[PDB]
Amino acid sequence: TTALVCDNGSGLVKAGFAGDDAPRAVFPSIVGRPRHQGVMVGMGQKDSYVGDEAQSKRGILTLKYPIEHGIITNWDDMEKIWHHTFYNELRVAPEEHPTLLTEAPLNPKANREKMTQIMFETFNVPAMYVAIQAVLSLYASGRTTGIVLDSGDGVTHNVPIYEGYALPHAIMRLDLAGRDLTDYLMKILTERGYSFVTTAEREIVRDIKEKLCYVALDFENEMATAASSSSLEKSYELPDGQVITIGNERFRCPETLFQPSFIGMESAGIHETTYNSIMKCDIDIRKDLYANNVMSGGTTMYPGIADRMQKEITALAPSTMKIKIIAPPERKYSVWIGGSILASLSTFQQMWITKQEYDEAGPSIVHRKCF
Amino acid sequence: TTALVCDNGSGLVKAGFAGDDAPRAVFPSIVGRPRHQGVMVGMGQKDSYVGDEAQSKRGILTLKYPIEHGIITNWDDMEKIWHHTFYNELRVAPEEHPTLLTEAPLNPKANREKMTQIMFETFNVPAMYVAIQAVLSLYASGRTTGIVLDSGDGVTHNVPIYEGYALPHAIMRLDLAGRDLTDYLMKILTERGYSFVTTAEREIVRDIKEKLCYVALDFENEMATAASSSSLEKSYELPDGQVITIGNERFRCPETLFQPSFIGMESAGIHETTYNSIMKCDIDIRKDLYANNVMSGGTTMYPGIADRMQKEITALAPSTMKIKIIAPPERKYSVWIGGSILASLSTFQQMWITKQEYDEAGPSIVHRKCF
Amino acid sequence: TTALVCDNGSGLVKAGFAGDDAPRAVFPSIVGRPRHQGVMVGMGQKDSYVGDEAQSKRGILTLKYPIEHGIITNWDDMEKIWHHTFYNELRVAPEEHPTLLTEAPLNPKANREKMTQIMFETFNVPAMYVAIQAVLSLYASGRTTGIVLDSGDGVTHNVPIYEGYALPHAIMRLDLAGRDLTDYLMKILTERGYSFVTTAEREIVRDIKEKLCYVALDFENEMATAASSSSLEKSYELPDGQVITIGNERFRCPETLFQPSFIGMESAGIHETTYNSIMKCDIDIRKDLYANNVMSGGTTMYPGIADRMQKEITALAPSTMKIKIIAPPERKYSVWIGGSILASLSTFQQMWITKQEYDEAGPSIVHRKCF
Amino acid sequence: TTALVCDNGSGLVKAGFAGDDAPRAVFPSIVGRPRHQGVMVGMGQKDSYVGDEAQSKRGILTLKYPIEHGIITNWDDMEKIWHHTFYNELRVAPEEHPTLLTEAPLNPKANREKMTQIMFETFNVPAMYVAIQAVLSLYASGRTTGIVLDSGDGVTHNVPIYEGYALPHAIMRLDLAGRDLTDYLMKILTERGYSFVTTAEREIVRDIKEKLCYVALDFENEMATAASSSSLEKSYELPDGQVITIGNERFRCPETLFQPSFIGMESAGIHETTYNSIMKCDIDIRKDLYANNVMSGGTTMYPGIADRMQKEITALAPSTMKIKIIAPPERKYSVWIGGSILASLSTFQQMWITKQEYDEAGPSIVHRKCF
Amino acid sequence: TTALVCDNGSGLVKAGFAGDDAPRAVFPSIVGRPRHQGVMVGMGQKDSYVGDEAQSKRGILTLKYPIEHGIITNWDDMEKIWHHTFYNELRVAPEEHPTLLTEAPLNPKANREKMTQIMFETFNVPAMYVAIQAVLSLYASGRTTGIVLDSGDGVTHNVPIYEGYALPHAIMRLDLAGRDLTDYLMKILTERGYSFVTTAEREIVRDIKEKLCYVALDFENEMATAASSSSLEKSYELPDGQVITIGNERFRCPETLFQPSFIGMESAGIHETTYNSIMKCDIDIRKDLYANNVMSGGTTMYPGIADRMQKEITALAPSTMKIKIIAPPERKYSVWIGGSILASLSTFQQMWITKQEYDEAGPSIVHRKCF
Ligand SMILES: C/C1=C\CC[C@H](C)OC(=O)C[C@H](c2ccc(O)cc2)NC(=O)[C@@H](Cc2c[nH]c3ccccc23)N(C)C(=O)[C@H](CCCCN)NC(=O)[C@@H](C)C1
Ligand SMILES: Nc1ncnc2c1ncn2[C@@H]1O[C@H](COP(=O)(O)OP(=O)(O)O)[C@@H](O)[C@H]1O
Ligand SMILES: Nc1ncnc2c1ncn2[C@@H]1O[C@H](COP(=O)(O)OP(=O)(O)O)[C@@H](O)[C@H]1O
Ligand SMILES: Nc1ncnc2c1ncn2[C@@H]1O[C@H](COP(=O)(O)OP(=O)(O)O)[C@@H](O)[C@H]1O
Ligand SMILES: Nc1ncnc2c1ncn2[C@@H]1O[C@H](COP(=O)(O)OP(=O)(O)O)[C@@H](O)[C@H]1O
Ligand SMILES: Nc1ncnc2c1ncn2[C@@H]1O[C@H](COP(=O)(O)OP(=O)(O)O)[C@@H](O)[C@H]1O
Ligand SMILES: [Mg+2]
Ligand SMILES: [Mg+2]
Ligand SMILES: [Mg+2]
Ligand SMILES: [Mg+2]
Ligand SMILES: [Mg+2]
């Protein structure tokens, strides 16, 4: 009846209905299991906990993420998350509405084929479609031309779009994402003697990162300042009441996005990746892509990311070029919003894969580009 | 028919039926034998006396405790106690009801294996189960999360439980218990010239301890006060009418629980043991364990123990943490009560070791964790 | 057939049959011999006289007591007494009934071994047993707990018994007895010019003591009163019609029992001896022993002994203790009665030393404690 | 003059001079203090005992380890150990030779900064350097490529090295180490009724572990065998002459290294940790790392560890890959030996931090990577 | 000037000067008073007699011991003994030398406080110290490690010492001592008809014990032998020329030390007490304590005590343990000798309580442990 929109982002499930300006259900993409004992099956105990349950009880659970680098590998856990998304969070049977899913570009074909099989055989979804997140993000901004840099939990990717058309030969993908920034920070923090090694401890570091980190406009000068100025340090209170101090780690973590070599990657930084995607595009397109660099995704939340990227692109770009970073306060939900918008358009209504077409055509249909 | 509950606590047998809010049979875990002469077997004399008999006639008997540090070592005497518990105190044949027994954690495997053999071969018990006392105590409070400090006659132990799950790597056990506090007091009292050296005299000191001792909130200031203030002294009338005066011994005895070094132990005090058990638990669990420290067992009867423990944990705990000591007027019977509750639950009804399963499986079955 | 009971008390033989509530034969334990001439063996004259004969003819006989301080030393005279007890007084052959004898505690082993040899070799007694008098006295009262103070002619002794058991480490024995009280009075009376130096004269003093003496409740005040009040004096008529006056000697004689130093002893008085025996007993026993101090034996006949002992024990005892003196009108025969009772019990019937066991085991059997 | 090499390993100090093929001074990293009384300061008594003294007198001392999980926390005790290492064991003044120290990777920066301050301000060391143990261990083997698994007393760590270069993004660290294996065994042994709770008792368990434990090649089959076969049990004689029997505990203890969940950890087993470190390395490096897995450190002493690790890596590794475990009889001293070798090289002679450079540069110099 | 050493042992005063290898003054701790008459104060008569006077005139005196179970209760008599020790036996004014006193462990605090008050207020002693006898005895042997069993007249005690340190939690005290052995023998001897009931008679029994008793290596076999062999009997000549025969009483008396139940005690025998004190000590200490069991005190004079104790400890000890009894010919004076040694050491010279410190600090100073 109303298209259902579900962004199976790494680390976070965002879902709601088309026409809604926000997801209704927002919870971690986490499935947890008991760590220290078995399940008291003859008593009030469960085999697994999901999303908010997984977080509330995280101190006794081993937590797993079914999605790694944007690819679903743990299909059983992925179904558990969907099972709750549909029946406990949105509380809607799948048989009632068509569903729009999202995906990072350049994944295994199997990832689409398996999501499709599940949505038609485990959940009886009337029709479905799987969209690229960068495209939806641009729909959310309302522009037809620009380059979208979606930097999430598992994948960072750049998809230039011009006058509504994709420029696929220029799509670039990095493995570096929020999951790695968290892991890097866990390692950085051992320098101050704070050792976080368990899964729940990983979740704490993630929370620290989210509240304390920022992007230095000038890393070296910020670091030189940090070396002597105590004004850089901030305290953080841990769940058990202990208090720790975070210093230059507040900006050394996100710096990884500009310098991937910090974690051993040969990868381009986000400002080099963006630049190269633009350079792979036609000379008469480049002007507009520089003019409209569009940010989206949770890692773009670090304060100052917009200014640092403006500086870096400007430095790489021709001196007579106008460079602008577009970074609305709603970047975190850009994909979800784009989903809601697209799902409600009369043009999109013609692109759905119905169950009947799927059953007759088979899995190859998921690679259909109807438009 | 009705599960029978029997807490074979060191120094005291507490038994009754499931569904009863109190034990029906409460008597000392003591077997006595004549000290000065043989048994007039051709006349009205016995070889041994048990429980109340052992106490009423204690002046002519050598008394023994079959349980040391929570471990049954004198199996013949243990059977004599059970023989009376079933046939003279509760006056029920074992063949009529299933029986729930209790145990301290981390004992020899043999202790469970031997109790089981006796309950199926000497007493024909239809089915049985042996539970950990800390767990039962938490059932009695009705909470699912908290740390239970059971401090009895032979063992003091700490078992953290979270959301119904055990956290076994954090179980801590101390040897210090009520039996040692009594022995320490017997030694302290020689300072005033009161020498208690026989077994019956030990029982008198135990009675003195029970009526006069308290926990100083501040040991050093209480002691400094005691040094000059006569208001600290209390009289006690001995069974033969002689009267003695007890001074600072009233609080020096229980202080041992906070300072085990007084009796030569390297052991943590009860407030350090509790704290460390909490620190061995996951950071996202610790908050609730601090919030709910649950006391149980006879040594927690000393007036003021709740306030002294509150002070000590608070001092060790983070300053932003909420610490609360839970110490109901019924702590002495918490294990028994938990026994009654568990025994009546439909979940527990599935966990019993039946005689038939025992006979086929053998003794290894006692280590079964059905739940 | 019927056990024969014979109490070979110093100075007096009391014998009868088990089941009889009184001895049938009561006569002095005295053997006399002619003093002034030889025996007219060719005429109607005897070599010796026994018991009543010894008393009726005492003015011409030297009289001897075969028992000194409870120990038989003159075995030939002891046999003469037994010879008459069996054949002239009870008129029963020893071969017809088993015999129960009595003894003071802590005597030479030989005393039991010799009585046994005589009873199996001179008198053909089927079986025998030698009992402690304090024990029999307690049987006579019917109590199982109490301390018995048997004060007879040759020995005074204290045997605490608790719940039917002996407490042998607390048995105390004094040499002071009725024989000494008589000798002391003979010496006191020389003060009034009445000199009694022969054996028959000793018997007269014994008779005077028996009729005139009493225990002062308060010796010093009684003596101070006696110093000026003629109401204290009593007359006594001697066998030859002469009349003498006895004054404060009436209470100075029995006072010796409270003050043994009057006759040169280091010994405890009877109230100190009783007290110390109780103090040597376990603290949880002492309460009952104070509650039941049981008197027996001929020296307890002095009027007022019960009240004086009540005063003295009360003074030594704790102020919150209940002290009671048990002193029935039948104290003089308590041992004999206890003998009759024990002899008739089915438990006692198993404890007898038979002649056959004696002949095979030898004399060591007399120290058997069958019970 | 000659570089001094000192491996401040947790639980054991190994020191000697560069060029020496073995440490000269090997003693426990233990500082002990009197447990039952104060120090008789006016007599022949000490405040503390160190190393061998701490062990010889351990029955009266509380013993402490200044190093926990590879981190020095008790700096005063650490200086006492160094004080003896230099003046009593090696008997060399620090002013005479430069010193090479060792460290686990990923520690607090402060650990290096504090060791440096002590070595320049308390001990006047001419120059110093602090090396990573895994690196030294590889120098000891003589290889330039391989992965080193150093498993000691407080830390287990994996540092892949390729063609002389570190691959730091793949360094993995576990908390599980010999100290935990000992604690686990102390808990396992309560099953047989052997309770070790004091510090000296901990040292006994450590000795038991060292002589009796081995790694099962197949844990489940070894355990199933142990269940019925008495050939598994071994006796051990305790210091006081008592004898105890150890059964399957001989292999259940070291099994923890393959299954850390036995002690509540979420940690990878040693064979998973090694495997993952290799997988984090470049695909063209992995082949050599599989070929050369190098073991070092005291926990690798358990007999059979080499074969069990060979089995586990082989199972995880590709089937066409050659996997080899390198485990020389000298693994226990690999770090010390590597120290001696490096210290004598002409390349290393250029890397020393001199006192003068330290005084001018300050503590940040300890993080210098001169090479 | 020279420390004075005075061992106020129960029943015997041993005193001399530090540096002397023997006491100069050795006499009974006895105060006697006239028994049969008053004091002829207008003639050559005294109110009391002390020590040797008390013994020479014992037949007319009641003798008292001011010390019972190691505790001074008759303070007036204690001063009379000290009065003679200082002025008639050593003939030294107390004002001239500092004095070292001895004490049994675990006495009333008052015993030290009162001895101190007397030594500073009745006798003007410059300085004093009160030492534990077990400690001094070990000084006399010259060992620093061993367990000392001091068995004297009123108290038997066991104080383990390791490497010069006390292990106070393992101090054990028995009431059984030489005074009880004497009383038991007085009771045993009534079996042969020898009744000793006065105080002087007690002294005779003490002399008999000292010359005739021995410890059976094997009590039951010695007793079985004694039952038929006349070679066991020995004669003894009494002060009045009468001769008595002592048989198995020669070994039944000292047997009490191994079997305290003979006199009604629940107490451990001396070999059980020693064993338990060792078992209460740390496992790494026990080996040396078994190796060095040190005997001291007058009751260890019975011939054969060393061999019987060797047998008993060996039987209780582990079979691989080396057990040795140390029992020099000088055991009787070990405490005195240790006193002389300690008193002369430069370390001890710092531990004295001076009169000035006492006057300012008050009685609590007597519990000072300066060392
Ligand atoms: C915030 C946080 C910890 C800090 C607690 C407190 C507020 O601060 C300190 O006290 C710092 C203080 C400090 C000590 C010394 C110094 O030279 C400089 C610093 N660190 C230590 O003791 C460290 C030591 C440690 C253990 N393995 C490590 C691995 C790498 C680095 C350090 C460690 N230790 C006990 C923890 O990290 C523990 C447990 C880790 C192992 C679990 N298997 N971890 C936590 O609780 C988590 C939530 C992290
Ligand atoms: N303010 C913030 N700063 C840094 N990281 C953030 C912030 N907010 C969210 N994140 C990170 O973004 C990721 C989730 O955001 P999102 O892009 O929605 O993930 P996904 O699209 O994979 O669901 C997490 O890694 C989270 O820590
Ligand atoms: N009010 C009290 N104060 C101190 N100790 C007490 C008190 N009441 C009981 N106890 C002690 O508690 C012990 C018995 O209590 P309990 O915990 O039930 O023992 P158990 O569980 O071993 O049977 C005894 O050591 C007893 O002296
Ligand atoms: N009423 C009395 N007052 C004082 N003494 C008495 C009295 N009656 C008996 N006796 C004394 O008691 C002794 C005999 O009593 P008894 O106890 O039966 O002696 P035994 O038990 O030795 O045969 C004699 O010494 C006698 O004088
Ligand atoms: N044969 C062995 N088996 C098991 N553990 C051992 C063995 N030898 C030594 N160990 C353990 O190794 C640790 C000390 O070795 P080492 O690696 O040198 O420690 P560190 O490097 O921390 O000084 C201790 O925990 C010790 O018990
Ligand atoms: N050879 C011996 N055999 C048995 N007992 C002895 C011997 N010598 C002395 N005694 C006993 O030892 C006690 C006195 O010795 P001692 O230990 O010096 O006493 P104290 O230390 O109390 O002064 C007395 O009880 C005495 O009888
Ligand atoms: Mg996303
Ligand atoms: Mg209990
Ligand atoms: Mg009588
Ligand atoms: Mg190491
Ligand atoms: Mg002595």
Curated annotation (Swiss-Prot), chains A, B, C, D, E:
PTM-bearing positions, type N6-methyllysine: K80
Record-linked CDD domains: ASKHA_NBD_actin
Modified residues (Methionine (R)-sulfoxide): M40, M43
Modification after translation, per record: Oxidation of Met-40 and Met-43 by MICALs (MICAL1, MICAL2 or MICAL3) to form methionine sulfoxide promotes actin filament depolymerization. MICAL1 and MICAL2 produce the (R)-S-oxide form. The (R)-S-oxide form is reverted by MSRB1 and MSRB2, which promotes actin repolymerization.
One of the protein's GO biological processes: skeletal muscle fiber development
Catalysed reactions listed for this entry: ATP + H2O = ADP + phosphate + H(+)
Keywords: Acetylation, ADP-ribosylation, ATP-binding, Cytoplasm, Cytoskeleton, Hydrolase, Methylation, Muscle protein, Nucleotide-binding, Oxidation
Region named Interaction with alpha-actinin: 106-119, 354-366
Domain of life: Eukaryota
Positions bearing ADP-ribosylarginine: R173
Keyword Manganese annotated: no
SMART domains: ACTIN
Signal peptide: none
Pfam family, one: Actin
Entry's localization field: Cytoplasm, Cytoskeleton
Modified residues (Tele-methylhistidine): H69
Family: Belongs to the actin family.
Further comment: In vertebrates 3 main groups of actin isoforms, alpha, beta and gamma have been identified. The alpha actins are found in muscle tissues and are a major constituent of the contractile apparatus. The beta and gamma actins coexist in most cell types as components of the cytoskeleton and as mediators of internal cell motility.
Protein name: Actin, alpha skeletal muscle
Organism: Oryctolagus cuniculus (Rabbit)
